[PDB]
Amino acid sequence: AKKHLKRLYAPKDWMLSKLTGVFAPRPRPGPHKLRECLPLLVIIRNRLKYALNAREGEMILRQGLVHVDNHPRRDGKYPAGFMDVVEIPKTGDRFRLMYDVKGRFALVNLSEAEAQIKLMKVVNLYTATGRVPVAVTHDGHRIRYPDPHTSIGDTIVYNVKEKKCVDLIKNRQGKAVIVTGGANRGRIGEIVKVECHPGAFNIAHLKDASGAEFATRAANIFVIGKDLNNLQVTVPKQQGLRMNVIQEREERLIAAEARK
Amino acid sequence: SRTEDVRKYVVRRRVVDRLKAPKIQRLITPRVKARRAKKAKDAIAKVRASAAERREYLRLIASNRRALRQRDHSKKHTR
Amino acid sequence: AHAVDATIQHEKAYQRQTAVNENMKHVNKSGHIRYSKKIGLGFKTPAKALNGKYIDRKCPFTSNVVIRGRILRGVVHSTKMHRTIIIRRNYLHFIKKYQRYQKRHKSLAVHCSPAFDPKQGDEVVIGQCRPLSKTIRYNVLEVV
Amino acid sequence: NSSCVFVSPIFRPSTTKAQVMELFAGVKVQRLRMYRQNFAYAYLDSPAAAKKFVEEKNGTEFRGHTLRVALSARSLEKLRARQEAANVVIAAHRHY
Amino acid sequence: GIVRSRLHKRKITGGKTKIHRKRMKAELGRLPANTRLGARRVSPVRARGGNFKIRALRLDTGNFAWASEAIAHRVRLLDVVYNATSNELVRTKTLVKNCIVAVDAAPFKRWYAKHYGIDLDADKYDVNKASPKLQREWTRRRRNHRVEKAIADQLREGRVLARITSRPGQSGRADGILLEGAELQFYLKRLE
RNA sequence: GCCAAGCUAAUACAUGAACCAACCGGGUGUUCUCCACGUGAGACGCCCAGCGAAUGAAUGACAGUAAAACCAAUGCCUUGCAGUAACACCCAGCAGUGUUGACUCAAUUCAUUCCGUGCGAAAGCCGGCUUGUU
RNA sequence: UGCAUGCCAGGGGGCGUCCGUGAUUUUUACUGUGACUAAAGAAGCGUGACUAAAGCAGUCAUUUGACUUGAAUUAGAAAG
Numbered sequence: 006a007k008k009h010l011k012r013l014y015a016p017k018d019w020m021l022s023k024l025t026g027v028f029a030p031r032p033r034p035g036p037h038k039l040r041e042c043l044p045l046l047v048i049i050r051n052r053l054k055y056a057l058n059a060r061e062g063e064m065i066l067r068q069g070l071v072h073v074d075n076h077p078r079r080d081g082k083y084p085a086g087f088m089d090v091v092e093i094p095k096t097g098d099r100f101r102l103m104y105d106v107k108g109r110f111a112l113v114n115l116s117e118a119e120a121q122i123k124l125m126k127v128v129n130l131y132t133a134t135g136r137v138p139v140a141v142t143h144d145g146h147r148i149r150y151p152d153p154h155t156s157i158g159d160t161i162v163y164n165v166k167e168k169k170c171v172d173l174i175k176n177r178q179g180k181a182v183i184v185t186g187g188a189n190r191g192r193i194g195e196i197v198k199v200e201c202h203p204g205a206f207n208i209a210h211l212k213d214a215s216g217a218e219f220a221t222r223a224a225n226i227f228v229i230g231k232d233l234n235n236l237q238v239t240v241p242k243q244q245g246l247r248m249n250v251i252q253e254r255e256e257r258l259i260a261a262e263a264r265k
Numbered sequence: 266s267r268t269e270d271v272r273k274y275v276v277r278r279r280v281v282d283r284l285k286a287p288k289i290q291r292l293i294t295p296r297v298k299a300r301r302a303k304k305a306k307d308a309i310a311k312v313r314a315s316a317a318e319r320r321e322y323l324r325l326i327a328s329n330r331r332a333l334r335q336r337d338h339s340k341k342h343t344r
Numbered sequence: 345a346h347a348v349d350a351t352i353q354h355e356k357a358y359q360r361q362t363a364v365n366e367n368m369k370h371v372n373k374s375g376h377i378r379y380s381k382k383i384g385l386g387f388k389t390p391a392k393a394l395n396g397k398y399i400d401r402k403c404p405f406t407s408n409v410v411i412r413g414r415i416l417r418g419v420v421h422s423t424k425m426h427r428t429i430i431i432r433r434n435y436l437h438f439i440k441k442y443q444r445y446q447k448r449h450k451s452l453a454v455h456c457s458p459a460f461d462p463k464q465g466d467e468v469v470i471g472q473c474r475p476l477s478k479t480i481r482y483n484v485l486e487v488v
Numbered sequence: 489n490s491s492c493v494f495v496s497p498i499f500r501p502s503t504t505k506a507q508v509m510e511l512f513a514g515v516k517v518q519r520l521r522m523y524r525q526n527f528a529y530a531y532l533d534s535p536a537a538a539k540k541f542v543e544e545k546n547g548t549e550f551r552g553h554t555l556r557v558a559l560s561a562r563s564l565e566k567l568r569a570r571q572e573a574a575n576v577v578i579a580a581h582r583h584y
Numbered sequence: 585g586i587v588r589s590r591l592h593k594r595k596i597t598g599g600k601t602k603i604h605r606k607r608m609k610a611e612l613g614r615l616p617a618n619t620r621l622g623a624r625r626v627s628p629v630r631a632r633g634g635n636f637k638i639r640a641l642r643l644d645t646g647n648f649a650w651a652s653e654a655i656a657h658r659v660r661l662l663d664v665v666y667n668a669t670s671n672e673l674v675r676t677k678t679l680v681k682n683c684i685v686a687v688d689a690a691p692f693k694r695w696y697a698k699h700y701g702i703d704l705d706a707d708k709y710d711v712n713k714a715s716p717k718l719q720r721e722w723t724r725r726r727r728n729h730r731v732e733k734a735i736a737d738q739l740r741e742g743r744v745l746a747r748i749t750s751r752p753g754q755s756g757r758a759d760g761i762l763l764e765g766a767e768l769q770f771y772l773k774r775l776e
Numbered sequence: 777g778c779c780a781a782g783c784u785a786a787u788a789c790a791u792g793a794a795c796c797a798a799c800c801g802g803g804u805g806u807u808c809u810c811c812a813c814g815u816g817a818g819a820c821g822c823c824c825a826g827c828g829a830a831u832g833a834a835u836g837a838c839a840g841u842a843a844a845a846c847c848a849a850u851g852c853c854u855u856g857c858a859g860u861a862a863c864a865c866c867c868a869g870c871a872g873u874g875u876u877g878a879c880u881c882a883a884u885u886c887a888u889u890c891c892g893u894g895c896g897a898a899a900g901c902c903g904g905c906u907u908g909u910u
Numbered sequence: 911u912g913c914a915u916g917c918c919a920g921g922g923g924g925c926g927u928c929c930g931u932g933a934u935u936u937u938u939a940c941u942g943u944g945a946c947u948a949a950a951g952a953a954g955c956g957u958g959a960c961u962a963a964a965g966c967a968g969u970c971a972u973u974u975g976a977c978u979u980g981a982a983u984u985a986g987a988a989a990g
């Protein structure tokens with residue numbers, strides 16, 4: 006199998022410079038896919054700047070100082086993907102990995118009793134030996150006895166500290182979702198209708214708070230609340246609202262001159 | 266004989282002074298005895314926890330079916 | 345329980361389905377045990393598959409062959425193989441430099457279950473399946 | 489509190505109606521019903537009679553089985569009240 | 585070695601394929617078992633992923649099922665009488681899936697007496713020694729089911745035809761099912 | 777590149793853990809206790825009942841019409857059917873409901889089989905204190 | 911752990927979901943949108959590395975830190 010990862014082949018969201026080195030940290034198999042993850046070494050070195058290089062990143066990580074989903078991880082190649090709770094007790098950071106409107110990975114700061122809650126999207130349901138229903142989540146968790154109303158596509162809000170399910174949000178029209186893939190990744194909208202194409206890809210049509218309509222495949226949506234005004238999780242600052250490119254450029258020019 | 270310490274009879278070789286004595290392997294101490302017995306207690310506790318988890322799930326499934334049975338019976342009685 | 349069907353059993357080995365015990369869920373209109381499943385994608389199972397005598401281990405309706413992948417449409421070209429047909433997919437290919445099209449075609453070997461009886465010139469709907477022979481990757485799902 | 493008593497196990501296929509009355513000797517039982525689920529519903533005369541019947545029968549061996557007894561919340565007068573309501577529609581069903 | 589690739593095959597155009605890679609272990613084949621009748625003799629084969637196949641070389645016992653009764657029994661294999669591939673496999677007494685074999689009928693006869701209280705031959709099960717709770721159970725079972733005539737004649741003779749359902753060269757076993765219905769009549773004609 | 781003989785380890789190799797310790801099912805006894813003069817009921821005895829694998833049988837639903845009698849059995853009502861998930865106690869709701877676009881799939885029950893080519897609590901190691909046959 | 915169940919009544923229509931039966935059954939190209947689609951490279955926004963080829967940096971206070979810093983957007987045949 007492949008053990009290396011060239012820097013040019015690494016995902017662009019990692020923001021690794023092409024002139025710094027030839028290689029990038031190859032993500033180990035784990036909770037999240039290689040293409041849709043942020044390695045722990047990248048987080049501790051490039052994002053938080055707690056480590057100036059990989060040598061100090063290994064020193065921090067191999068001590069167990071970094072917790073993901075309330076469990077220390079000593080491997081810098083740990084996947085650490087979407088909606089993961091990362092907390093450093095020695096400094097008290099407690100952020101959550103989310104997507105901004107640009108689609109880049111964002112570290113949304115969390116509070117106490119919010120770092121205990123994680124949202125998991127159900128990707129498969131099956132019966133284990135002994136007639137035990139099991140739900141597989143987007144981060145690889147297997148729930149031994151999910152809610153009887155659970156279905157593929159629904160999201161389970163999960164207590165990481167208590168290791169139990171607290172509630173279920175069903176995938177239905179009118180619910181608030183966040184796009185986790187494609188060109189619309191990081192946008193937050195409300196389900197209008199789902200175009201069901203058997204054998205093919207189901208298409209979900211969404212509308213954001215402003216009123217703009219955008220679509221994506223049904224596998225890219227992630228229910229996060231009953232409606233846009235009620236979200237079970239805290240989203241980044243932009244609130245999943247895509248802004249016009251011309252409008253954004255003018256605002257940055259105005260703000261920059263205002264500062265000076 | 267059994268119930269007799271074996272550390273006292275371990276062969277020691279002296280060099281010219283250090284007395285070289287091998288480390289005794291498979292010497293099951295009370296510390297090791299507690300460690301072994303804890304494994305069996307944990308294993309039986311785990312399967313009982315899952316059996317209790319199955320019972321609670323089955324209670325939820327049965328109660329939901331019972332409630333629907335009681336709902337339409339009351340509706341038929343009030344009919 | 346039943347007598348030997350001579351018109352169906354001429355193969356030096358007894359022809360039978362593998363999903364049901366025929367000499368005993370799946371009972372046809374003629375009061376016989378016959379396995380038949382419903383394929384997805386909104387395709388109706390033909391009545392011959394439901395109520396028929398033929399034994400086909402490669403039929404998508406009465407065997408373990410499943411349909412997944414591409415669904416294509418073509419025109420029957422040759423009907424000389426046993427339970428296999430050749431279909432033609434005629435299309436126009438665009439040449440960018442000349443801004444014009446040219447006529448092109450492709451030929452596919454498709455397994456045809458004994459429930460369709462297509463003729464040369466007929467147009468069929470085919471669905472992708474596992475390799476059934478050296479050149480067969482599709483199964484006939486409908487005849488128009 | 490109540491005059492009815494729950495009695496189990498009473499195996500109907502292995503016993504007669506009079507056979508189970510032997511354990512009720514000395515008590516004036518009005519109505520006695522036997523069920524497929526190996527239990528019997530008996531309606532006594534007074535709440536005190538029923539109460540004094542369950543402090544000496546719980547655990548006793550009857551017909552080769554330890555008896556489990558407890559006061560029942562079912563009431564005798566409700567049965568008669570519902571019976572006529574059921575009885576009129578039995579005759580009303582004939583009228584259709 | 586033996587390969588299962590299509591590189592050596594002709595194209596549908598009849599042209600020759602110019603191979604530009606060496607043979608791969610992922611496309612290998614192996615020599616056939618050619619399992620014959622005889623005292624048990626198997627050889628394990630380490631396969632892809634570290635798993636083991638059982639390449640049976642000689643087999644003379646198997647677990648054979650009576651489908652109508654929904655039971656099975658371990659019986660010894662007496663003979664192989666028909667093969668659709670070729671009669672040469674019958675001549676060599678080769679055991680492959682779907683081949684017609686003759687098995688010992690004694691265990692099935694014994695179970696019939698225990699279940700229905702019927703002696704077909706009239707060790708030897710004494711039906712009269714059964715408890716009265718069992719003889720009453722015999723009456724319920726007997727009324728619903730009647731034995732097939734063609735099966736009974738075989739059971740008296742001591743050998744009953746059956747079809748092999750397992751793959752001896754892959755699993756090392758010689759399981760099978762008793763022939764019944766039109767399938768039994770089909771092969772009876774072929775065997776004169 | 778190499779023999780031969782002497783030692784000695786294990787997380788190498790081999791062997792092997794009853795009671796504590798449950799729920800559930802199938803097959804049986806010329807076993808007894810009761811009912812009826814056998815779709816009888818209940819105890820006790822015996823044979824098996826784990827994961828995975830093999831063959832066979834059955835499940836893996838329904839969704840193209842409205843009411844009456846009769847016989848047998850059994851439920852209840854009382855001494856004739858209103859009406860009611862199912863189940864002959866010890867569990868009066870301890871799955872009547874897996875999934876897919878689609879399955880001979882997931883999983884469950886029954887019968888038989890596994891013979892080296894599966895299945896230890898590594899019969900393992902290290903820490904803390906409070907220093908503990910839980 | 912019935913710790914459960916019901917409490918406007920009604921008829922009549924309006925819908926969601928799944929299945930069955932029925933149109934002497936209508937596609938393809940084109941075109942408009944939308945979805946999906948690694949970087950590097952190309953186009954391009956912002957940014958006085960002294961300029962530039964570049965790079966994705968840095969900037970501002972003077973701080974035990976702000977900017978909840980930035981790293982925008984495009985095109986990329988054909989087929990699907």
Ligand SMILES: [Mg+2]
Binds near residue numbers: 412
């Ligand atoms: Mg698919």
Ligand SMILES: [Mg+2]
Binds near residue numbers: 290291
């Ligand atoms: Mg040791």
Ligand SMILES: [Mg+2]
């Ligand atoms: Mg080992």
Ligand SMILES: [Mg+2]
Binds near residue numbers: 836
């Ligand atoms: Mg189903």
Ligand SMILES: [Mg+2]
């Ligand atoms: Mg289904």
